[PDB]
C-alpha cells in the first residue's frame, strides 16, 4: 500500500521538472528537515478504504534557526553551508543576521495533476498549508514514534540466519495523518524558490507571497531568473518583510536596464505590484512613502526642464526633445514620490516603465503591446500632461 | 417583401396556382408596428395618395373616456394586462386595438371628487362596486379603441359592467 | 466511519448554538425587568411610601409579583441542576436528582445557587486549562515553551474593584424611585455619573445582541409550421461544417466535470 | 396610577414571558453517544449564571425591606460570570472558531445528502 | 475611473431627442456642433436598436432595427455603414456564424428564423412556437433555439434538418447559453431554476434552483453567460439580481444586485481586457462593472435612455450599447484597456469628450418596499438617501433588513 501510494506521489512530483529525477528520492527520505503534505479529495465512507488519488503534493523543508555566531563567521568567510538556502541567501543579499535566526519553511516543490490544473486545487492546498502552521487546526477530540533496533539485537543476529523482513504493520504509524493529529512546528515565514515566469508569478501573487530577491544572472539551462518570495504568517512580526520588500523594489527599478531589459513590460509591472502588496500588508504608518518636496523637485529638475516638459504637454515640442527627463520621471512614479495625485492605467504604466527603466524604444513597445506607434506616443503624452499638472500644483 | 396578393394562395378548388407576375406596388404590405410603452415616438409613413399614416412605435399616454360619466381624460398607461388575440403581446407589453391595459386613475378620481363633491347627490355619485375597488387600488382597467399602428393614437375607454366582469373572469 | 463521528459532533455543536440563541432571548425578555428593577426604591421608608400611594393595588401586585419569581427561579434552578447534570458538570448524579425532586424555598434556592456556581468554578478551571493546552500545542506555543485563559480569568477576578466600578456606571442615567428623598435623609450609606446602587450591563447586553445579530447574518395543425417537420431542408443543407478538433477539454475531463456539476492503517 | 404599580406590572409581564420561554427552552433540552464540546458547554453555563445573577439582583431589589439595595452578592456573581464569558472563553473559541465551522458545515452537507 | 461617451444622446431623458434635433439645427451655429467627432457615420437607427454584436474577425459589426425593421452592418476600416437590409418583421435575436458578417442567423418575432448570406435572405423557416433566444454550437453544427413551449428546438445546419428537441421540465426558456471549453449548455426557465443539458448526449446534467434569501418574490432567469474558463457561470434574475456560480459547487459565490429592480438583460465577462475578475451586468436603466471575486463596483455606464443590449469589443475598452434612442450609444473606458486599432486616435481627443460620471455601488428601494421592509425609520437619516420616487440604501444593510422582514 505504501509503495502504491509512493508511485502515485512520484507521478505528481515528477510531473513537471527538468530531468533532475534520481537524487530527490534520497533527499526526501533521509533529510530530517523535509516533510510531505498531500491534498486529497473528500473521502466517501462507502469507498471501503480504497486510497484516493493525490490532487496536490507539497514538499516543505524546515530552514532557519541558525545561530548568529555561525552566520557572521560564514558571512565573513564567504563559505556557504549545505541546506538552508533562503536563510543564507537573504542574509548575504541584505547583510541581515536576524533573518537567519528566524525559523521558516521553504516550499521545495508543489505539484498538481496536469489534467486538473487551473481549477484552484493548488491554491487551496497552500491556503490549508498556511492554515496548518498558523495553529488553526486544533484538535477536536477530548504517539507516532518507532522504536529502533537495539545494538544488542544486531550483535546477536547471524548473517546466514538473518530474517530480513518488512516491519510489522502494527508498529508502523498510519500513512496519512490528519492535520490536527500532528502538531506543527512554529514558523515565522513561508518561502518559495523558482524560476520567474508569468504563470508562476501570478500563482504566488494570488497566494499573498511577496518577492524579496531576484537573481540577475539567468540560469543557463532554463534562461529563467531565480526568484525568492516570502510570506509572513499571522501572529509573527511582519516589519522585516516590508523593509526587504521596499529594498527589493528599489533595487529592481535600477536593474531593469542592466540585465532584466528582456523582461516584458507587463511582467516587470506585475513584480512591482506584488511587492507593493507588502506595503498594504502592514497597517503601520511608521514606514510610508514620502511625497516629493519642492526642494527635492528643484534639485531633480531645473526650471527650464519643467518648461520643456510643460510645452510637450501642450504639443508644442517633439518627442525626442524630452527623452532625457523620462527615466527620472519613471523612478519618481514607481518610487511613489508623486503621491495620490497622479495615477496611471496598466497600459500607461507599462509604457512609462519601458521607456524610463527598460530603456526600450517607443516602436519596440508598440510591437510588444500590439499597439500602433501613434497610440503609444498619444498614451505617452497623456502621462506627462498629468505629471505636468502635478508639478504645477506643487509649485 | 410583404404582399397582400391572393395569387400565391391555392384556389377554392385546391389547385396550386403559378406566379402570374412579379409583385406590384398597389398590393403592398408594410412591416407591423409593435407599439410598446415608453417615451412617445411616432414614425410617419407616406401611403397611397397624399395620405399619411402614423406609426406609434412607442406611446405612453392616451385619451381614455369614461362612458358612464360621459367624460374623457388623458392618462398614462401602466402596462398591458390581457390581449384577446395573442398572449405573447401581453408578455412583451405590446399595444394594439382591443388590448386591456392598466391606466392611472388620478385624473378620473380628481374629476369625480370635484364634480360630485364626494371622496371615492349621493345617489348620482353611486358607481359600480368593482370600479370603486379599482380606484381604491389606484389603477383602472381600460380597453384601447384606437389602432396605434395606423392613427398614432392610443385612445380607449374604461371597462364597465358585463364587459369588466368578463375580462376580470378571463384575468 | 470517522465521518459519522464528525456528524454527531456537528449535530452536537449546533445544539449549543441554538441553546445559545434561546438563552440570549431569555436575557432579552428579562432586559426590561432589569431596567425597571433599577428604577425601584432602595430603602424601607421609600418602599412603604410607595405602597402608601396605592395600598390595595400595590399589595395585589406585590403578591402576584412575589409568586412569579418563586415559580420562575425555582424552575431556573431545576434547569441548572439538569443542565449541569447532562453535561457532566456535576458528578454526584444521585444528589442532583434529589434536589430536582424536592421543592425548595427562597433561602434554600439561594444555597443551590451558591453550590451550582462553586461546581461551575471547578469545571471552569479544568475546562479552560484543558483547551488552552490544546490550542497552545496546536499552534506550536508548546514548542515555544499569551497567558493561560484560566490564569487570565483569575487575574481579572483579582481586579474586582475596577470591574465593580464599571457596573456602577450609570450610562442610562436611571433614577430609582424616591432616590432624592433617600439621599437627603442619609439613608444611603454607600453614596455618602457613578451610582453604586444602579446596575448597568448595557455594553455587555449590546455586545451579546451584536454577536447574535452577526451570527444570524453570517449563517444566512401541421399548417403554418405549428408542428415540427423533420424532413431535410435543402437550402440550409451543408450551411456550416463541424469542427473536428472538438472542445478544448478532453472528453474524460468533460464527463467528470459534468458528473460533479452542481455538487496498515491508511488514515 | 402610582409609579410602583406601573413598574410592578412591567416586571410581571417580563416574568411570564421569561418563564414561558424557559418552559420552551427546558422542553427542547429534555428532548435532546452524542458527546458535547466542553468549552461551549461552560460558555452556556456561564451566562446562565449571569442571568441568575441578574435575576438575583432583581429579587434583592424587589424585597420591600431592601436590606442590600446594591445587591452586592448578586452583582459579584454577575461579575464572575461576565468575566469568564468575555476574557476567558472568547479568545479560545476564536482560536477554535474555524474548526467549529468546518464540522458544522460537514454535517450540513451530510444532512442535505441524506435528504 | 472615467467613462467617456464617444457618441449618443447628450440630452436628458425627459427631453425628446427628435425635437432636440429640430432645435439642434437652430443651434448649428454653436461651434461645438462643428467640432463634434463621430466615430462611425450613420451609427443611428431610425427609432431604436434591438441588438448589436461585433464579428469575431474584429473588423465588422452588425445591428438590428425597429422601423422599417432593418439590419445594419458596419465596417470599422471605412468607419461607415456597409449596407442596410430591410426585413419583414422585428428581430428578437441573431448570431453571426462566420468570422465575418457573411453568414448570420436571425430569429424574428413572427416565429420565423431567417438565414442571411452575402447576397441576401438565403432561407426562412418557421419554428413551432414563439422564440426568445438563440445559440449555435460550432462542434455539433446544431442551432439551439428556445421558445415559449417547454421543448428547446434543435436544428442542424450540417444536415439541414430539425432534430429531436430537448424537453425542458419547465415551460418556457427565456435565455440559452453554451460554453466553448466545456460544451455545457444552460436554459433559463420562467421559474427560478436553470436546467443544464449536455450536447454530447441528449440529457439533463442537472438543475440549479436559484435561492434568494433577501427577496422572497418570484422571478425568472432572464440571462445566462458562461465564462471563458468554463468553471464559472452567471445568471440574470428578473427581480434584478445577477448570480455568479462556480459550476462545481451548488451555492452562489457572490450575489450582486443593480438595485433598480429591473431585469438583467446581458452579462459579459471582461476576461480579455486584463484583470480578468471583472463582469458586466446590464439593466434597462444602467450597466455596471464590478469585481468578480469581491463584488466591488469598478465603473458605471448610465445612458439617459433605456438599454436594450450591450456589447464589448474584445481586447479594448469600448462598449457599444443598443438603446431606445435614435443614436446608439458607445462608451470608452480608457482604464480597462487600449482603444481598438481602427479608432486609434480616439485616445488623443479624450479631453474633448463628455467625461460622464454612485448609483452602481448602492442599492435602491421602492417606497412600498421601504414600508414592507420596516425602513420608514431609516427615512430622514444618513443611512437612507432619497433618489426621486425611491431611496437608495447600502447593499449589505438591505440584505440584513429583508431577512428581518
UniProtKB/Swiss-Prot annotation, chain A:
Location within or outside the cell: Nucleus, Nucleolus
Residue ranges of domain N-acetyltransferase in the record: 38-173
Effect of disrupting the coding gene: Leads to a strong inhibition of 18S rRNA synthesis. Deletion results in an altered alkali-soluble beta-glucan phenotype. Heterozygous mutants show haploinsufficiency in K1 killer toxin resistance.
Residues reported to bind acetyl-CoA: 110-112, 117-123, 206
Record function comment: RNA cytidine acetyltransferase with specificity toward both 18S rRNA and tRNAs. Catalyzes the formation of N(4)-acetylcytidine (ac4C) at positions 1280 and 1773 in 18S rRNA. Required for early nucleolar cleavages of precursor rRNA at sites A0, A1 and A2 during 18S rRNA synthesis. Catalyzes the formation of ac4C at position 12 in serine and leucine tRNAs. Requires the tRNA-binding adapter protein TAN1 for full tRNA acetyltransferase activity but not for 18S rRNA acetylation.
Similarity comment: family membership: Belongs to the RNA cytidine acetyltransferase family. NAT10 subfamily.
Subunit structure: Interacts with TAN1. Associates with 90S pre-ribosomal particles.
Protein name: RNA cytidine acetyltransferase
Lineage: Eukaryota, Fungi, Dikarya, Ascomycota, Saccharomycotina
UniProtKB/Swiss-Prot annotation, chain B:
Region annotation (Disordered) ranges: 1-30
PROSITE patterns, alphabetized: RIBOSOMAL_S8E
Matching Pfam families: Ribosomal_S8e
Keyword NAD: no
Modified residues (Phosphoserine): 65, 68, 72, 85, 129-130, 133, 136
Subcellular location: Cytoplasm
GO MF: structural constituent of ribosome
A single Gene Ontology CC term: 90S preribosome
Residue numbers bearing the Phosphothreonine modification: 61, 106
Family named by the database record: Belongs to the eukaryotic ribosomal protein eS8 family.
NCBIfam families, alphabetized: eS8 (TIGR00307)
Role of this protein: Component of the ribosome, a large ribonucleoprotein complex responsible for the synthesis of proteins in the cell. The small ribosomal subunit (SSU) binds messenger RNAs (mRNAs) and translates the encoded message by selecting cognate aminoacyl-transfer RNA (tRNA) molecules. The large subunit (LSU) contains the ribosomal catalytic site termed the peptidyl transferase center (PTC), which catalyzes the formation of peptide bonds, thereby polymerizing the amino acids delivered by tRNAs into a polypeptide chain.
Protein name stated in the entry: Small ribosomal subunit protein eS8A
Annotated organism of origin: Saccharomyces cerevisiae (strain ATCC 204508 / S288c) (Baker's yeast)
Taxonomic lineage: Eukaryota, Fungi, Dikarya, Ascomycota, Saccharomycotina
Swiss-Prot record, chain C:
Any GO CC annotation of this UniProt entry: 90S preribosome
Residues of the signal peptide: none
Keyword Acyltransferase: no
Compartments in which it is found: Nucleus, Nucleolus
GO BP: maturation of SSU-rRNA from tricistronic rRNA transcript (SSU-rRNA, 5.8S rRNA, LSU-rRNA); protein transport; rRNA processing; vesicle-mediated transport
Keywords, sorted A to Z: Coiled coil, ER-Golgi transport, Nucleus, Phosphoprotein, Protein transport, Transport
Main localization, broad class: nucleus
Keyword Phosphoprotein tagged: yes
Induction: Up-regulated during cold stress and following nutrient replenishment by dilution of cells fron exhausted to fresh minimal medium.
Domain of life: Eukaryota
Additional free-text comment from the UniProt record: Present with 15400 molecules/cell in log phase SD medium.
Similarity-based family: Belongs to the AATF family.
Role, per record: Involved in endoplasmic reticulum to Golgi transport. Involved in a protein-transport step blocked by brefeldin A, which disrupts the Golgi apparatus and its incoming protein flux. May also be involved for mass growth or cell proliferation.
Protein name: Protein BFR2
Organism: Saccharomyces cerevisiae (strain ATCC 204508 / S288c) (Baker's yeast)
Curated annotation (Swiss-Prot), chain D:
Stretches of the chain forming a coiled coil according to its record: none
Location(s) in or outside the cell: Nucleus, Nucleolus
Modified residues (N-acetylserine): 2
Function: Component of the U3 small nucleolar ribonucleoprotein. Required for the early cleavages at sites A0, A1 and A2 of the pre-ribosomal RNA. Participates in ribosome biogenesis.
Miscellaneous notes: Present with 1430 molecules/cell in log phase SD medium.
Name of this protein: U3 small nucleolar ribonucleoprotein protein LCP5
Record organism: Saccharomyces cerevisiae (strain ATCC 204508 / S288c) (Baker's yeast)
Gene (UniProt): LCP5
